[PDB]
Design a protein around this ligand. Sequence first.
Ligand SMILES: COC(=O)c1c(OC)cc2cc3c(c(O)c2c1C)C(=O)[C@]1(OC)C(=O)C=C(OC)[C@@H](O)[C@]1(O)C3=O
Ligand SMILES: [K+]
Ligand SMILES: [K+]
Ligand SMILES: [K+]
Ligand SMILES: [K+]
Ligand SMILES: [K+]
Ligand SMILES: [K+]
Ligand SMILES: [K+]
Ligand SMILES: [K+]
Ligand SMILES: [K+]
Ligand SMILES: [K+]
Ligand SMILES: [K+]
Ligand SMILES: [K+]
Ligand SMILES: [K+]
Ligand SMILES: [K+]
Ligand SMILES: [K+]
Ligand SMILES: [K+]
Ligand SMILES: [K+]
Ligand SMILES: [K+]
Ligand SMILES: [K+]
Ligand SMILES: [Mg+2]
Ligand SMILES: [Mg+2]
Ligand SMILES: [Mg+2]
Ligand SMILES: [Mg+2]
Ligand SMILES: [Mg+2]
Ligand SMILES: [Mg+2]
Ligand SMILES: [Mg+2]
Ligand SMILES: [Mg+2]
Ligand SMILES: [Mg+2]
Ligand SMILES: [Mg+2]
Ligand SMILES: [Mg+2]
Ligand SMILES: [Mg+2]
Ligand SMILES: [Mg+2]
Ligand SMILES: [Mg+2]
Ligand SMILES: [Mg+2]
Ligand SMILES: [Mg+2]
Ligand SMILES: [Mg+2]
Ligand SMILES: [Mg+2]
Ligand SMILES: [Mg+2]
Ligand SMILES: [Mg+2]
Ligand SMILES: [Mg+2]
Ligand SMILES: [Mg+2]
Ligand SMILES: [Mg+2]
Ligand SMILES: [Mg+2]
Ligand SMILES: [Mg+2]
Ligand SMILES: [Mg+2]
Ligand SMILES: [Mg+2]
Ligand SMILES: [Mg+2]
Ligand SMILES: [Mg+2]
Ligand SMILES: [Mg+2]
Ligand SMILES: [Mg+2]
Ligand SMILES: [Mg+2]
Ligand SMILES: [Mg+2]
Ligand SMILES: [Mg+2]
Ligand SMILES: [Mg+2]
Ligand SMILES: [Mg+2]
Ligand SMILES: [Mg+2]
Ligand SMILES: [Mg+2]
Ligand SMILES: [Mg+2]
Ligand SMILES: [Mg+2]
Ligand SMILES: [Mg+2]
Ligand SMILES: [Mg+2]
Ligand SMILES: [Mg+2]
Ligand SMILES: [Mg+2]
Ligand SMILES: [Mg+2]
Ligand SMILES: [Mg+2]
Lengths: 64, 5, 51, 84, 96
Amino acid sequence: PKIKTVRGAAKRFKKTGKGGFKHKHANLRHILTKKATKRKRHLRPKAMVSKGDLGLVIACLPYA
Amino acid sequence: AAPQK
Amino acid sequence: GIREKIKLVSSAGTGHFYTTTKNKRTKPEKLELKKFDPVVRQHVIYKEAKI
Amino acid sequence: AHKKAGGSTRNGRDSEAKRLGVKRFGGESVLAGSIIVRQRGTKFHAGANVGCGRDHTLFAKADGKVKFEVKGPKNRKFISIEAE
Amino acid sequence: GFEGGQMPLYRRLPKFGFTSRKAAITAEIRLSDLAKVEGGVVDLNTLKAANIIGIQIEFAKVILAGEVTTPVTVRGLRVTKGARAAIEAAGGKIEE
RNA sequence: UUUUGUAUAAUGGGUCAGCGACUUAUAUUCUGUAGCAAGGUUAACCGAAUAGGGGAGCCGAAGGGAAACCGAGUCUUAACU
RNA sequence: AGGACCGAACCGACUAAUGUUGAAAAAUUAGCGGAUGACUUGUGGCUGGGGGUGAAAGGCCAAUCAAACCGGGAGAUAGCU
RNA sequence: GUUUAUUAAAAACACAGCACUGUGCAAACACGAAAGUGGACGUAUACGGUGUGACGCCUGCCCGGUGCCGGAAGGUUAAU
RNA sequence: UGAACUCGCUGUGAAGAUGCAGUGUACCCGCGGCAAGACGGAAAGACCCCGUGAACCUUUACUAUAGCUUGACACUGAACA
RNA sequence: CUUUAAUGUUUGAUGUUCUAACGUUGACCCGUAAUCCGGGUUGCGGACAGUGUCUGGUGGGUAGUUUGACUGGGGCGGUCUCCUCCUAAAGAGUAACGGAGGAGCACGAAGGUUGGCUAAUCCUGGUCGGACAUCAGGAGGUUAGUGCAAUGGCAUAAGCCAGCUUGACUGCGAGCGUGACGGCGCGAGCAGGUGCGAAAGCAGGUCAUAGUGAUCCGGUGGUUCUGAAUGGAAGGGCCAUC
Ligand SMILES: COC(=O)c1c(OC)cc2cc3c(c(O)c2c1C)C(=O)[C@]1(OC)C(=O)C=C(OC)[C@@H](O)[C@]1(O)C3=O
Ligand SMILES: [K+]
Ligand SMILES: [K+]
Ligand SMILES: [K+]
Ligand SMILES: [K+]
Ligand SMILES: [K+]
Ligand SMILES: [K+]
Ligand SMILES: [K+]
Ligand SMILES: [K+]
Ligand SMILES: [K+]
Ligand SMILES: [K+]
Ligand SMILES: [K+]
Ligand SMILES: [K+]
Ligand SMILES: [K+]
Ligand SMILES: [K+]
Ligand SMILES: [K+]
Ligand SMILES: [K+]
Ligand SMILES: [K+]
Ligand SMILES: [K+]
Ligand SMILES: [K+]
Ligand SMILES: [Mg+2]
Ligand SMILES: [Mg+2]
Ligand SMILES: [Mg+2]
Ligand SMILES: [Mg+2]
Ligand SMILES: [Mg+2]
Ligand SMILES: [Mg+2]
Ligand SMILES: [Mg+2]
Ligand SMILES: [Mg+2]
Ligand SMILES: [Mg+2]
Ligand SMILES: [Mg+2]
Ligand SMILES: [Mg+2]
Ligand SMILES: [Mg+2]
Ligand SMILES: [Mg+2]
Ligand SMILES: [Mg+2]
Ligand SMILES: [Mg+2]
Ligand SMILES: [Mg+2]
Ligand SMILES: [Mg+2]
Ligand SMILES: [Mg+2]
Ligand SMILES: [Mg+2]
Ligand SMILES: [Mg+2]
Ligand SMILES: [Mg+2]
Ligand SMILES: [Mg+2]
Ligand SMILES: [Mg+2]
Ligand SMILES: [Mg+2]
Ligand SMILES: [Mg+2]
Ligand SMILES: [Mg+2]
Ligand SMILES: [Mg+2]
Ligand SMILES: [Mg+2]
Ligand SMILES: [Mg+2]
Ligand SMILES: [Mg+2]
Ligand SMILES: [Mg+2]
Ligand SMILES: [Mg+2]
Ligand SMILES: [Mg+2]
Ligand SMILES: [Mg+2]
Ligand SMILES: [Mg+2]
Ligand SMILES: [Mg+2]
Ligand SMILES: [Mg+2]
Ligand SMILES: [Mg+2]
Ligand SMILES: [Mg+2]
Ligand SMILES: [Mg+2]
Ligand SMILES: [Mg+2]
Ligand SMILES: [Mg+2]
Ligand SMILES: [Mg+2]
Ligand SMILES: [Mg+2]
Ligand SMILES: [Mg+2]
Ligand SMILES: [Mg+2]
């Protein structure tokens, strides 16, 4: 049968031109008053999945 | 059955 | 501790607000400060409000 | 006889090591922004073309070669950058 | 995605965004495709008949990819700023 | 065989003959090799049937953005050195 | 008269020895307990598996019981050998 | 008397007797999706459950905790 | 029951040697006896630990539920205070 | 409005009668050769009891499960995250149920800036006044101070005092350090708009290092995004925050 996508990963990574994955940063959901604005500002932009992680992501997203 | 150690 | 969270609301018509922690017991009078409002792009008075 | 229970230690705690110390040595070429020393307090002081951060981290404000030197009446250790 | 019981990477990270339903009914056309239609008039019906776009498509943009040499008239499509210049240089015209 | 380590006094086998354990289906990715090449390929089905027909579809040649949208650029921002 | 006494048949199973690849998957020999009673025995019947029955030992329910046997789910699962 | 068929026969189980408690009869209670059946072709001097265990002398204090029984004012509280 | 041409001692050694080192003794093969050793045979230790194994049991562990119990609506009507 | 009275109406509750639903494991007749069942007559109950749907309580009677790891064997005891010092072998890192201590915050001033200032302790002389209060002088030279452990820092003070303030700003960020990663940290300089200062300049919290918790789910405010025929809306996204 077809491989099934891990649907929880499809909600969290998106593929990019050269095949890498962008993701949203952690730590920016709650408990925000105590975090410095410098720290919070750097967490807004999307980020690229690291080298050691790509193997795990690609397994979950066979049809990306 | 037997006595055990 | 008694240091409790509050928010400061822009006195302009914008919705923009800051959050901060206040010792409710020892300083019962409202905090009030001029701060930058990035919606109007001006320094404006901000006043304490409930979180 | 009876095997007798031991007690317990009251110690057993430590913190994570912080990787302080010199990160670029004398004569080493650096780019602007490069951290040269991680410190607690100013064990080294900022010389020419060197900045000091809020946690006393010394960093390059210009490209050049790191120069360590001793200066002043207190014989304090200063780090400076010399243009290449 | 199992990691020995550590919280796995696809669950440390927040979900984001949403899926547009309008995106699925939108297509992009290349300049090199404009020569493939029959009859020199480019519109959604003509591009569908050429099997250049799917039957469900309702919106299409011509974009500056490849090149076009024959004159063409583009009707009812949207056109990028760069694609417009290319069609005009070929002696075509865009209308709406 | 299992172990840091076995002549081990750790395991297993009395011997002979026969049988006895990395398979198959369908997706996906990488390598080799063959055809075609900005193109490649058909599925079901039809077929006096391994032919021929069938291009419905699928991958590729464009990306950025949560999205509207813009497009060799785009997002971020009032604006980018 | 008697859940009376002694003691055969009958019912049981307190001690010792033998046996332990036995004559026997619970026996034999010599002693032992009850023996008109809450006794024993023939034939037939009824109670069925989280159920039965139990003067209660988790005891018995076809040499099997802290949940019988047979068939099926079924090649359960086995980070173990 | 009874008991671990097949390593335990006993101080264990039962016992007559005692006490508490439930049950007014279409009884309580048990087996049954239910019908129905046992209790019982019985009727509180009867029937069920629990603890104790012939007989003799006896069985003292605690109702705070848990349980059961009675009460209903007030607080709270479901569907509607 | 791996195969044997199957001695003692002291040492060594997966740390308690018929089989290794050194050394002592010993013609080849039966029969009747005894059991000190072959860590002798029988049973994938029943003690202990482990397994994000099992079972059955307890309770003011958790979540349900049969039963018991409360009320509303239906079957279910008339009159009056 | 408040206290309050009657009338009318609606709706709820309680009580007493009634018969006709309903009950009858009361009697009698018939099916009938029948202590089952059904029909008939009659008596007693009677809108109760009983049953269905919904609902609160109780409920080891029954069922499915959970009940951590480390550990000089397990149990019992102790520990589980973060900061500082030693062990640690003069770069970084480095274990043990090794040796020693702390945190789970505080502060709109204890932050910014401009101006100024310099400690402990001891000895002399002085009302009450004493070993120790405030005052003057001297010695001393940081042996003090740092909001809270310890280490490293601090006189250009980072220690102490006063005036004016909100930079405890918004968008970004060359370039580095440290992690397997998630992440954490330092940062010149740009754009906007501020505070102190004559100006050069300084300010993106606090002498630095602890004062903390991913994702999911849900709440609150905003918004030039989306809106299942169409116009809205709900719901979702994005931004701030809980
Ligand atoms: C320390 O104690 C012993 O060393 C020992 C023992 O020393 C004389 C004798 C025995 C005897 C037996 C058992 C033993 O465990 C046992 C033990 C441990 C069993 O477990 C038994 O084994 C078939 C069984 O399966 C069930 C039974 O009772 C539930 C027993 O009756 C059993 O039948 C038996 O004979
Ligand atoms: K083996
Ligand atoms: K072993
Ligand atoms: K062994
Ligand atoms: K073994
Ligand atoms: K393959
Ligand atoms: K009989
Ligand atoms: K069973
Ligand atoms: K006896
Ligand atoms: K017994
Ligand atoms: K007694
Ligand atoms: K009591
Ligand atoms: K009581
Ligand atoms: K009481
Ligand atoms: K022997
Ligand atoms: K009647
Ligand atoms: K240990
Ligand atoms: K030990
Ligand atoms: K060290
Ligand atoms: K000040
Ligand atoms: Mg948010
Ligand atoms: Mg001993
Ligand atoms: Mg440390
Ligand atoms: Mg965990
Ligand atoms: Mg070993
Ligand atoms: Mg060897
Ligand atoms: Mg061996
Ligand atoms: Mg041997
Ligand atoms: Mg083996
Ligand atoms: Mg063997
Ligand atoms: Mg007799
Ligand atoms: Mg018997
Ligand atoms: Mg006999
Ligand atoms: Mg006799
Ligand atoms: Mg007798
Ligand atoms: Mg007799
Ligand atoms: Mg019989
Ligand atoms: Mg027992
Ligand atoms: Mg049997
Ligand atoms: Mg079972
Ligand atoms: Mg199955
Ligand atoms: Mg199997
Ligand atoms: Mg007797
Ligand atoms: Mg027995
Ligand atoms: Mg016996
Ligand atoms: Mg008793
Ligand atoms: Mg008493
Ligand atoms: Mg009560
Ligand atoms: Mg040898
Ligand atoms: Mg040798
Ligand atoms: Mg030798
Ligand atoms: Mg012999
Ligand atoms: Mg013998
Ligand atoms: Mg043996
Ligand atoms: Mg074993
Ligand atoms: Mg485990
Ligand atoms: Mg249970
Ligand atoms: Mg329970
Ligand atoms: Mg299960
Ligand atoms: Mg353990
Ligand atoms: Mg070191
Ligand atoms: Mg070293
Ligand atoms: Mg100053
Ligand atoms: Mg110090
Ligand atoms: Mg501090
Ligand atoms: Mg609509």
